[PDB]
PDB file of C-alpha atoms and ligand atoms in Angstrom:
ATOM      1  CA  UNK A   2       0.000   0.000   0.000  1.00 16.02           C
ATOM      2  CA  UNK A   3       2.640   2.842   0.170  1.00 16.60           C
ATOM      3  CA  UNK A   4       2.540   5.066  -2.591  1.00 21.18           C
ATOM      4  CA  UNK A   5       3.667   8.959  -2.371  1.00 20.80           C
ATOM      5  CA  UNK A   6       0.082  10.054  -1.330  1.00 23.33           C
ATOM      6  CA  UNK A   7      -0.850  12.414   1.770  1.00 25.92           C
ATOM      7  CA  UNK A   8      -0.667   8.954   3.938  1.00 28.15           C
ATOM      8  CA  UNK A   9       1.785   6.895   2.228  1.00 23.99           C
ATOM      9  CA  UNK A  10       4.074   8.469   1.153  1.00 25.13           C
ATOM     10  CA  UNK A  11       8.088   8.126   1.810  1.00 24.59           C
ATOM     11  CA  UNK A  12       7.919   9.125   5.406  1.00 27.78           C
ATOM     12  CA  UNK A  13       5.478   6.099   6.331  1.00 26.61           C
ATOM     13  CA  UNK A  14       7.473   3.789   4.207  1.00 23.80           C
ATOM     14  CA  UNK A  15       9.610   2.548   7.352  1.00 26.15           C
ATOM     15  CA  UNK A  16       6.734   0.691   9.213  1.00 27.43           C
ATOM     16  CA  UNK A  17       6.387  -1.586   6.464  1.00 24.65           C
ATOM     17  CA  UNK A  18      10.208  -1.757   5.598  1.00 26.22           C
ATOM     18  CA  UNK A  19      12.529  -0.733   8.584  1.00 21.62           C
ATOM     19  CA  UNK A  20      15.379  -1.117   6.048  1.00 21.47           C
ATOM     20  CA  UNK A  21      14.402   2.589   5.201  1.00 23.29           C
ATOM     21  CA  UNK A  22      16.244   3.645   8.171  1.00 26.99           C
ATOM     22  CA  UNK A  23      18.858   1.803   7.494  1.00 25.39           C
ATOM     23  CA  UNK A  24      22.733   2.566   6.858  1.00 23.58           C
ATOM     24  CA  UNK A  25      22.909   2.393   3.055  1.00 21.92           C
ATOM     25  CA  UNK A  26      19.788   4.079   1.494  1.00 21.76           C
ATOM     26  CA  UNK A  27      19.378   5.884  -1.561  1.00 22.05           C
ATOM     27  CA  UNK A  28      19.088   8.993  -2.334  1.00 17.99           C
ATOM     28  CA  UNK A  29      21.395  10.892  -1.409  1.00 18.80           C
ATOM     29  CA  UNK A  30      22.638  14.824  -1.398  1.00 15.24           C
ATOM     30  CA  UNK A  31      26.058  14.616  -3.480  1.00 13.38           C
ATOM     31  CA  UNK A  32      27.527  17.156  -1.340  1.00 15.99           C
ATOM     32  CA  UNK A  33      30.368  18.337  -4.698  1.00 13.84           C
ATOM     33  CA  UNK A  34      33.215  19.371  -1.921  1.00 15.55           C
ATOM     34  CA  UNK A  35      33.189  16.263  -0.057  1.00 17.56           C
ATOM     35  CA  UNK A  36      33.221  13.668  -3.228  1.00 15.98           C
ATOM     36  CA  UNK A  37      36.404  12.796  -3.310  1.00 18.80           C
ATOM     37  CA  UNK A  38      37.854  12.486  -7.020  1.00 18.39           C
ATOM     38  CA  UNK A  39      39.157   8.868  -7.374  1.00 19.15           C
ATOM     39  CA  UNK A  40      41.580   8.483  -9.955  1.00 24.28           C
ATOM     40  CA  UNK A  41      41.025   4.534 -10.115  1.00 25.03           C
ATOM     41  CA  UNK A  42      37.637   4.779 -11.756  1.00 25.37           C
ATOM     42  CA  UNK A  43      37.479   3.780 -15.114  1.00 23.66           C
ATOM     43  CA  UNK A  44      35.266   5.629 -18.000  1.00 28.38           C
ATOM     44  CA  UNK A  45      32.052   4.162 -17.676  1.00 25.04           C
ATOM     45  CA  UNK A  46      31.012   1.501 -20.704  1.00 25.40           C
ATOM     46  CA  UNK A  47      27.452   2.125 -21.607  1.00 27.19           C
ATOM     47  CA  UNK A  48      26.934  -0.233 -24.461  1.00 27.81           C
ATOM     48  CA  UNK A  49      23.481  -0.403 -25.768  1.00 30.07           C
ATOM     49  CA  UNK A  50      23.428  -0.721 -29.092  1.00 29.03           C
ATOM     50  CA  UNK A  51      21.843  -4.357 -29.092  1.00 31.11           C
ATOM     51  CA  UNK A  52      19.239  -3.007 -26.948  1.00 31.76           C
ATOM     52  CA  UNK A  53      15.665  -4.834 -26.889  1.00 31.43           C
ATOM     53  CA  UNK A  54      12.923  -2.434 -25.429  1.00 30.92           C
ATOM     54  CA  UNK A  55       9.900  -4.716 -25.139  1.00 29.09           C
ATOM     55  CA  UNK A  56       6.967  -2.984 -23.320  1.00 33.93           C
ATOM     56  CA  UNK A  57       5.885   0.291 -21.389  1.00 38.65           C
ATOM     57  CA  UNK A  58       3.607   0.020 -17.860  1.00 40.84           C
ATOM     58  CA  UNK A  59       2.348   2.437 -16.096  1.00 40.53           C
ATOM     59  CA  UNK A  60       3.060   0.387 -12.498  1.00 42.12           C
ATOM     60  CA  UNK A  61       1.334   2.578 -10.449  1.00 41.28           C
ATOM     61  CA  UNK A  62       4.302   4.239  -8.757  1.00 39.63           C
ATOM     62  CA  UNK A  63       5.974   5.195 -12.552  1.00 38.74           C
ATOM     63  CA  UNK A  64       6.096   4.070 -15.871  1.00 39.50           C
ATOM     64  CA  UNK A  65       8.837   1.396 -16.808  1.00 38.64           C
ATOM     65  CA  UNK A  66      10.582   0.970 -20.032  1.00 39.87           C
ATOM     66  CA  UNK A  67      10.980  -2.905 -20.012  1.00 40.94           C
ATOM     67  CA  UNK A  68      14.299  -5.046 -21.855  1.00 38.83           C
ATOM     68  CA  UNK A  69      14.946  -8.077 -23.031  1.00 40.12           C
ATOM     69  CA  UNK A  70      17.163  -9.170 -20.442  1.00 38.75           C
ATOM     70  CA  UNK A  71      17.931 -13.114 -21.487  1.00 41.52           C
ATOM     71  CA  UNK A  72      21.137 -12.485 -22.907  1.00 37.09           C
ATOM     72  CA  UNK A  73      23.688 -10.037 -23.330  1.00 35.78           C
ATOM     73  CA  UNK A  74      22.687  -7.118 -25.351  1.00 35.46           C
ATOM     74  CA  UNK A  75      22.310  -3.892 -23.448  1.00 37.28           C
ATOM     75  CA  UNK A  76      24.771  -4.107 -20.455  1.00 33.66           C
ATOM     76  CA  UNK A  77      27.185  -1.456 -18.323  1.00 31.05           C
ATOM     77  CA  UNK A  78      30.791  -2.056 -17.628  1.00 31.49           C
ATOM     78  CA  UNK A  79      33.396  -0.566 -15.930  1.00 31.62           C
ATOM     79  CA  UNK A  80      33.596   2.498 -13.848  1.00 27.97           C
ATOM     80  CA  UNK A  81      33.383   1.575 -10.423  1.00 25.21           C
ATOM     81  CA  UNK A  82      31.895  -2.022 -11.436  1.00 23.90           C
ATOM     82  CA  UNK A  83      33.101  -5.557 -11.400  1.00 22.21           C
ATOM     83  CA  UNK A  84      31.487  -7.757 -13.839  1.00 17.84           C
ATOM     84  CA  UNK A  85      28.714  -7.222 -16.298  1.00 16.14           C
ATOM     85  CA  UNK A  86      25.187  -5.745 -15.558  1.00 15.03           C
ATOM     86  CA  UNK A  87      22.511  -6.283 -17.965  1.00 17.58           C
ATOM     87  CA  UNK A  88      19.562  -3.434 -18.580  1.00 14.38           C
ATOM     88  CA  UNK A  89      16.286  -4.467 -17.496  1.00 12.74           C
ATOM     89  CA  UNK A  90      14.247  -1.480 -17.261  1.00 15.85           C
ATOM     90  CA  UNK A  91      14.541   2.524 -16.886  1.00 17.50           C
ATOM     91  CA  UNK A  92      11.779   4.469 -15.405  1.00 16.21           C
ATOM     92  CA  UNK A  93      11.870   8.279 -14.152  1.00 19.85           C
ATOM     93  CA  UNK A  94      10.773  10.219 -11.067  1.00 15.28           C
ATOM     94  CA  UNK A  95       9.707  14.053 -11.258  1.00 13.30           C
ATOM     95  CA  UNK A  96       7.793  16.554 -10.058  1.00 12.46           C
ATOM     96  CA  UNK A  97       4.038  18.946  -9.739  1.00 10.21           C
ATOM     97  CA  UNK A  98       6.414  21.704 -10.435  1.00 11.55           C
ATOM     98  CA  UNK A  99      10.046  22.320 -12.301  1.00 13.72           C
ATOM     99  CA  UNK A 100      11.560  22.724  -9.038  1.00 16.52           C
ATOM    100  CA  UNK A 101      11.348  19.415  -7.808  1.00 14.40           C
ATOM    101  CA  UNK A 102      11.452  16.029  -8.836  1.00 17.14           C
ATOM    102  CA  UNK A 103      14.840  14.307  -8.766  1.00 15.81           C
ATOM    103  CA  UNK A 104      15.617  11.936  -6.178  1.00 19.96           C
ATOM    104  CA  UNK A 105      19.299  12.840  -5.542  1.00 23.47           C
ATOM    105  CA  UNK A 106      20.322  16.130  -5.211  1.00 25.22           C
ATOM    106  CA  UNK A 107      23.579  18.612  -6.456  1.00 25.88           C
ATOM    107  CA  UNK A 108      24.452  20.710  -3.240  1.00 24.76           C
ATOM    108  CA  UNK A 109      20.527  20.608  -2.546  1.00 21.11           C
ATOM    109  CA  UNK A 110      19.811  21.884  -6.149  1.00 24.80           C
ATOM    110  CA  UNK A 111      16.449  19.333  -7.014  1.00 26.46           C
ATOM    111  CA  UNK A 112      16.837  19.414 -10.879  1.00 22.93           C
ATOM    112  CA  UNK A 113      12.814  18.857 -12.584  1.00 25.33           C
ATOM    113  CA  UNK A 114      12.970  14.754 -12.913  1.00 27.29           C
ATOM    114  CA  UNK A 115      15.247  12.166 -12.693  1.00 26.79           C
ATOM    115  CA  UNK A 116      15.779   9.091 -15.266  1.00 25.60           C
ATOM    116  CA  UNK A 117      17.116   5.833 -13.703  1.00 26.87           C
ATOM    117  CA  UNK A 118      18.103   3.052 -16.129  1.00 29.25           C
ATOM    118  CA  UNK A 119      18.631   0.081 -13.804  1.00 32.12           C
ATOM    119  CA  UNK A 120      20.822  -2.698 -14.517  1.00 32.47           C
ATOM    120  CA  UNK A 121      21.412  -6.206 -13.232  1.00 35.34           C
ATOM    121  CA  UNK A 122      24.461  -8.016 -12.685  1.00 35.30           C
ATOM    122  CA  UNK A 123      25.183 -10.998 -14.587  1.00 34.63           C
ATOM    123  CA  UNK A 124      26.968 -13.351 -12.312  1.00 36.70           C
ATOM    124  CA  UNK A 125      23.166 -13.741 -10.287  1.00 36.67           C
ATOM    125  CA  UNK A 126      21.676 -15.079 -12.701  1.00 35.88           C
ATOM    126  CA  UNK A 127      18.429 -13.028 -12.465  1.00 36.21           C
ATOM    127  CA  UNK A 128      17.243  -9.761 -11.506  1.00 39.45           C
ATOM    128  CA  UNK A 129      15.302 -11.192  -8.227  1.00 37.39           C
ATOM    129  CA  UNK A 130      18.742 -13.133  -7.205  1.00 36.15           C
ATOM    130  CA  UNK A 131      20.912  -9.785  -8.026  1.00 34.54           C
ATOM    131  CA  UNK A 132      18.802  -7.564  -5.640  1.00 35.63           C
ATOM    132  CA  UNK A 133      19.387 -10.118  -2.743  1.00 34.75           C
ATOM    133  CA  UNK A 134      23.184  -9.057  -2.505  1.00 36.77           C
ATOM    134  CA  UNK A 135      25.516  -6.166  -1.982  1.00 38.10           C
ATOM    135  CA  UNK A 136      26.796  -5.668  -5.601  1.00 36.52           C
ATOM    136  CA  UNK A 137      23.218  -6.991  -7.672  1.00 40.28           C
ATOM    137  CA  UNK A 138      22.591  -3.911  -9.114  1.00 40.28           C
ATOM    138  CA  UNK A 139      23.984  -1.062 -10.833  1.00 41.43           C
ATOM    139  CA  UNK A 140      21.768   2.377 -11.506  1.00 44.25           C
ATOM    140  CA  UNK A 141      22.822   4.909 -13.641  1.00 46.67           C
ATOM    141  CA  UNK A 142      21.026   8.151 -12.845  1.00 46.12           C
ATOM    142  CA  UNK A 143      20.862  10.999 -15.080  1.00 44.20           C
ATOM    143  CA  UNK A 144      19.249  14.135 -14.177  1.00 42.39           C
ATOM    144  CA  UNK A 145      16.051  15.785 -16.499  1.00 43.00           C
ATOM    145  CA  UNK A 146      16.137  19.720 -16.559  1.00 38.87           C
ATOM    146  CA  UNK A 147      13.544  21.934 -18.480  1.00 36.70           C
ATOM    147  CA  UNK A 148      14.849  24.089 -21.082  1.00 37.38           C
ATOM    148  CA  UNK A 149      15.071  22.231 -25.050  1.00 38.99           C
ATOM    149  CA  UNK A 150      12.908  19.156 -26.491  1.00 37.62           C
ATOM    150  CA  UNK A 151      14.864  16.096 -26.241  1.00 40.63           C
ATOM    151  CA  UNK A 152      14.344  14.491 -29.474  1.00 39.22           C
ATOM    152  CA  UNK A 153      15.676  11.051 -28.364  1.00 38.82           C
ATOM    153  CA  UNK A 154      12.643  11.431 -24.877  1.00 38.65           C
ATOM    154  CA  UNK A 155       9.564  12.209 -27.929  1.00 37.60           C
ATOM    155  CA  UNK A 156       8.598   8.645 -28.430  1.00 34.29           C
ATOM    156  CA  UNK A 157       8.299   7.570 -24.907  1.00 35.83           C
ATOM    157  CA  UNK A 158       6.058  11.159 -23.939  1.00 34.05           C
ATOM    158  CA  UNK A 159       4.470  10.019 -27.160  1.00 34.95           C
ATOM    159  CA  UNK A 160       3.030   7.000 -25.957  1.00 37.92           C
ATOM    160  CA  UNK A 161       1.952   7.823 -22.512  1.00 38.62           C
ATOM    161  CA  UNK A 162      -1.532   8.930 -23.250  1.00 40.48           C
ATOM    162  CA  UNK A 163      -2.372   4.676 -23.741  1.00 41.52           C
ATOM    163  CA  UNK A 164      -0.678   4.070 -20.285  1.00 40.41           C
ATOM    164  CA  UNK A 165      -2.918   6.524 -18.429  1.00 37.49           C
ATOM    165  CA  UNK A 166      -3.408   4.369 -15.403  1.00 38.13           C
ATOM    166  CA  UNK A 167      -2.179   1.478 -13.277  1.00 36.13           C
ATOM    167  CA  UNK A 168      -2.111  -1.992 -14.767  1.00 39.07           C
ATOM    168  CA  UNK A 169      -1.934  -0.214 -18.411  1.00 41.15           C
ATOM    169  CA  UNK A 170       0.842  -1.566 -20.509  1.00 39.39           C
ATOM    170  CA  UNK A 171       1.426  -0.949 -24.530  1.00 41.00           C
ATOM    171  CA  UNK A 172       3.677  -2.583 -26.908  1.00 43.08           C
ATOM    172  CA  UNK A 173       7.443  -0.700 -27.045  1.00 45.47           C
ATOM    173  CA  UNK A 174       9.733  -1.993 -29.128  1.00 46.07           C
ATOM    174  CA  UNK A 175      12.412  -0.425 -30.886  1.00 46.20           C
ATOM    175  CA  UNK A 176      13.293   2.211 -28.483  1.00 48.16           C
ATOM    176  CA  UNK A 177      16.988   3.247 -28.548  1.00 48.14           C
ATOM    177  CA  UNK A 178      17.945   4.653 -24.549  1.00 43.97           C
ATOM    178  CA  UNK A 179      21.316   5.813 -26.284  1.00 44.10           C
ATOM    179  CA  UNK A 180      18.902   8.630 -27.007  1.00 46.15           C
ATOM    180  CA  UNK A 181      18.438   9.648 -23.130  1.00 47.72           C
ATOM    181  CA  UNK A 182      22.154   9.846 -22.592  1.00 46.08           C
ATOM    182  CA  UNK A 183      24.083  13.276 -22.184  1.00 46.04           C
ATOM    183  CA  UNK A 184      27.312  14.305 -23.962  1.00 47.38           C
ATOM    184  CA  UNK A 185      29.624  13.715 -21.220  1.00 48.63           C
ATOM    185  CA  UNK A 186      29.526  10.385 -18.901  1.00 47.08           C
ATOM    186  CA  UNK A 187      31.334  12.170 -15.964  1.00 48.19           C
ATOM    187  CA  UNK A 188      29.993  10.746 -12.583  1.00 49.01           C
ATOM    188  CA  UNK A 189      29.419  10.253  -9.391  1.00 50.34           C
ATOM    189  CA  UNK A 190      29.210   6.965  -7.705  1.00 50.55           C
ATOM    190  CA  UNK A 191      28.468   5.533  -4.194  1.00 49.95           C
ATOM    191  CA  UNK A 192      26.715   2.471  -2.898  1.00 50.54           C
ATOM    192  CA  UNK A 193      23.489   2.473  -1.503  1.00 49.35           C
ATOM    193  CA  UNK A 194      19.761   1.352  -2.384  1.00 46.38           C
ATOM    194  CA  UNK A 195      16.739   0.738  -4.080  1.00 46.20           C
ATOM    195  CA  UNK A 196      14.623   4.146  -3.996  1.00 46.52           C
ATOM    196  CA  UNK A 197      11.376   2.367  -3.917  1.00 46.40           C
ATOM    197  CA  UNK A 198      10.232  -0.345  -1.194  1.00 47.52           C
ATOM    198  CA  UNK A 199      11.158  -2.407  -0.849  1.00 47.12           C
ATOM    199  CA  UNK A 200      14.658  -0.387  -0.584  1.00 48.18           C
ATOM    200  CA  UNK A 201      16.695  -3.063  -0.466  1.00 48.95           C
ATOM    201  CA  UNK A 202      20.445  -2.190  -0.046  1.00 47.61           C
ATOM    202  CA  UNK A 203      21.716  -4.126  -3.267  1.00 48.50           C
ATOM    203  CA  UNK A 204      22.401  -0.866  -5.616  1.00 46.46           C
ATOM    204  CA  UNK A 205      26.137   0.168  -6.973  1.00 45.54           C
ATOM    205  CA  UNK A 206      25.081   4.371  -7.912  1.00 46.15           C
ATOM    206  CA  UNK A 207      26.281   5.896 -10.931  1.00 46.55           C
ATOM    207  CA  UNK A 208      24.922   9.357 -11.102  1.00 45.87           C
ATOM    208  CA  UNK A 209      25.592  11.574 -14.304  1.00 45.92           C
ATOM    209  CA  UNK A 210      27.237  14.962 -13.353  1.00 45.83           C
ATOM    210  CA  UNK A 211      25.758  16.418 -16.929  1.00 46.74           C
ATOM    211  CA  UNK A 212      21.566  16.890 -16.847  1.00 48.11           C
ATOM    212  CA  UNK A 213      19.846  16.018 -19.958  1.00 50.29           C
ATOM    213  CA  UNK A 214      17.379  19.234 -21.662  1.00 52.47           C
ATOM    214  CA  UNK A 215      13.771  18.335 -21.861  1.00 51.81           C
ATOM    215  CA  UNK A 216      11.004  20.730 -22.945  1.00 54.87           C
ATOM    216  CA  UNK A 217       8.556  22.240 -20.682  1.00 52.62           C
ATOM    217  CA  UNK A 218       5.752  20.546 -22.737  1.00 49.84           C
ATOM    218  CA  UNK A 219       7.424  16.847 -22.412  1.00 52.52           C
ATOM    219  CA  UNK A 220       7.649  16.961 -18.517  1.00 50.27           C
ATOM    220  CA  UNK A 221       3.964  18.451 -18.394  1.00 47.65           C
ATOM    221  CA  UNK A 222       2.886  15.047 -20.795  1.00 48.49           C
ATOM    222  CA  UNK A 223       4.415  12.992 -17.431  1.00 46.94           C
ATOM    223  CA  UNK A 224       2.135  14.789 -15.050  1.00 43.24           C
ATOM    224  CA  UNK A 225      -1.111  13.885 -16.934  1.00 43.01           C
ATOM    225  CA  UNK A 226      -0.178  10.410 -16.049  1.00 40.44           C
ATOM    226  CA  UNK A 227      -2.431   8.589 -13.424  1.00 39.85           C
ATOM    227  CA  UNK A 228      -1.028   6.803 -10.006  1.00 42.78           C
ATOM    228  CA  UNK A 229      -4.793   5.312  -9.843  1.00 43.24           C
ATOM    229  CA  UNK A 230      -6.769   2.752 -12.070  1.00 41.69           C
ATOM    230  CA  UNK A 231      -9.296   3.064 -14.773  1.00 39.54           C
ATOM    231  CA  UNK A 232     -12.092   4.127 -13.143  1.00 40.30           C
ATOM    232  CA  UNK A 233     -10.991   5.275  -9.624  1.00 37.31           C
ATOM    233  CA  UNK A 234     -10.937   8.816  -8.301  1.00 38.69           C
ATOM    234  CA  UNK A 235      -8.192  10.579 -10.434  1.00 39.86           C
ATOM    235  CA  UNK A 236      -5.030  11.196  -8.796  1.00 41.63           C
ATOM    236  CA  UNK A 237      -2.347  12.580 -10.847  1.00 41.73           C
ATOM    237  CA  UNK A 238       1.006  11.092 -11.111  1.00 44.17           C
ATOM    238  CA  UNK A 239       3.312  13.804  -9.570  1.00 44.08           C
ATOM    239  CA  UNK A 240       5.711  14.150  -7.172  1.00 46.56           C
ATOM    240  CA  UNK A 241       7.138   9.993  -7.247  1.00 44.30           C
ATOM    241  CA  UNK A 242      10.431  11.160  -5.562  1.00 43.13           C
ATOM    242  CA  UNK A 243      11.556   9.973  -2.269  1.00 42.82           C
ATOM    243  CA  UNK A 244      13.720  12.867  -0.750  1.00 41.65           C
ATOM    244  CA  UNK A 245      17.685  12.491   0.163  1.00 41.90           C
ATOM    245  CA  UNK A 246      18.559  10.324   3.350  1.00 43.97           C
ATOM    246  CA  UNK A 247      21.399  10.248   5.393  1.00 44.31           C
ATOM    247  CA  UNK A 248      24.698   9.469   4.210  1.00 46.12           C
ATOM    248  CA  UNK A 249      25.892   8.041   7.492  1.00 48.20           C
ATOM    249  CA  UNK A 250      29.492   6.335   6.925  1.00 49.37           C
ATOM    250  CA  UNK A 251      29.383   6.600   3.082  1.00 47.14           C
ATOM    251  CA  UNK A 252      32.241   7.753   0.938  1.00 46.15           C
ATOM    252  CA  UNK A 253      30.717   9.537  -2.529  1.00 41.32           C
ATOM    253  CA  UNK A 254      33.631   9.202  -5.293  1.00 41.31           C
ATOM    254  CA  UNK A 255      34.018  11.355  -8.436  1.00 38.83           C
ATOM    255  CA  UNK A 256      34.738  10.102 -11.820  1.00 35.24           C
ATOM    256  CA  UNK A 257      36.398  13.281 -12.648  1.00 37.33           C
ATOM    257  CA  UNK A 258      39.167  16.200 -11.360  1.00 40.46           C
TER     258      UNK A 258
HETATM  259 ZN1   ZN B   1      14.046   5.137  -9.622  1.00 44.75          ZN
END
């Protein structure tokens, strides 16, 4: 039952899953002055041009971009990672207003929404095995701000209108994420959590320094979307970010000088 509602929202979450109060949850403020730049990080690989998008749902909580994750086609490599970690789904969190929306936060700047393409690694087997362990998953995080269209973002705001409400899924093939990406793949990185109950602490961060552009009138097509059900009161899908949490005895590392 927890949603992001006047009663459910992230500050209930707890009583159902006391690993929110826990020592390695996400997100975080990346406080710039304290990352520490680690020369040992590698470039991160992004290589997705094999991808297979299957299928867009409206979940409820957010709409996911699903992948055809049964072999090796869209994975992440190096940077702070061991191993391979195969693409599964990306989904975004934003906000009622420009001025909010992200999940992590740049020296407390919120940027407008926040895209998180979430990957699983390989040597698990599946995604349910990976998120049962420290290193399972790796989440690269790239921040939305309003200002120009995005072409590559057009076909998913496109589609959204037959995904109004929960349970609502349409056909999404051929989508290319290399589209979402920004210019530079500068980053920060620090281990912590699932953002979403049930929070577990399985997640290997890799958040973009660079924000992607959207237009004013693509992040306005995201807030017609629906948190509730055909038929049920409507209850616009706004404001599905759970705010920064403490960093407690967690080193954030920068890809970059
Ligand atoms: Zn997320």
């Amino acid at each position: 039952h927890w949603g992001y509602g006047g009663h459910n929202g992230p500050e209930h979450w707890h009583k159902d899953f006391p690993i929110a109060k826990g020592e390695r949850q996400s997100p975080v403020d990346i406080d710039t002055h304290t990352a520490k730049y680690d020369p040992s990080l590698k470039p991160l690989s992004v290589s997705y041009d094999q991808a297979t998008s299957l299928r867009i749902l409206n979940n409820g909580h957010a709409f996911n971009v699903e992948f055809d994750d049964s072999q090796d086609k869209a994975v992440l490599k190096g940077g702070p990672l061991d191993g391979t970690y195969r693409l599964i789904q990306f989904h975004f969190h934003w906000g009622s207003l420009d001025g909010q929306g992200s999940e992590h936060t740049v020296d407390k700047k919120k940027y407008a929404a926040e895209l998180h393409l979430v990957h699983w690694n390989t040597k698990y087997g599946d995604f349910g095995k990976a998120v049962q362990q420290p290193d399972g998953l790796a989440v690269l995080g790239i921040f939305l701000k309003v200002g120009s269209a995005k072409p590559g973002l057009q076909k998913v705001v496109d589609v959204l209108d037959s995904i109004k409400t929960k349970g609502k899924s349409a056909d999404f093939t051929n989508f290319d994420p290399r589209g979402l990406l920004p210019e530079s793949l500068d980053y920060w990185t620090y281990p912590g959590s699932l953002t979403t109950p049930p929070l577990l602490e399985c997640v290997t961060w890799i958040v973009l320094k660079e924000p992607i552009s959207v237009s004013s009138e693509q992040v306005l097509k995201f807030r017609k979307l629906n948190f509730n059900g055909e038929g049920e009161p409507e209850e616009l899908m706004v404001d599905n970010w759970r705010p920064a949490q403490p960093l407690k005895n967690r080193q954030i590392k920068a890809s970059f000088k």
